[PDB]
Write a protein that binds this ligand. Sequence first.
Ligand code: 54F
Length: 126
Amino acid sequence: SVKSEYAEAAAVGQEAVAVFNTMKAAFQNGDKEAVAQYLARLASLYTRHEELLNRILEKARREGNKEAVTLMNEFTATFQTGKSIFNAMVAAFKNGDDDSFESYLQALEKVTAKGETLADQIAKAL
Ligand SMILES: Nc1cccc(Oc2ccccn2)c1
């Protein structure tokens, strides 16, 4: 069902949270070889999550589930906010700009935390 597909998407999101916190520890310790690998891992994870979310939204639309569509349109928009911040973080890493990396890291955390009440609302709506 769309609901079990959302639970699968939610687990993929939690994997990115796990790899993100590990990466943050690695960055603070200056283990840039680890950070590079974790950033690659996170990129693939976000690509997957983004695809799952789009499929879920498209299915909610085909099902005429207006409330779930509204919530998923709001949540996907905020996902792109997180994604653009991630990508700028990756660029800051490539450039050796640790001040920007730190800024982007904290922002991506606040964007993610903010978008959690919505994420729980979608689970219930599908
Ligand atoms: N593409 C992308 C990459 C990193 C973080 C991010 O933020 C998120 C993740 C889930 C919900 C809201 N924002 C999105």
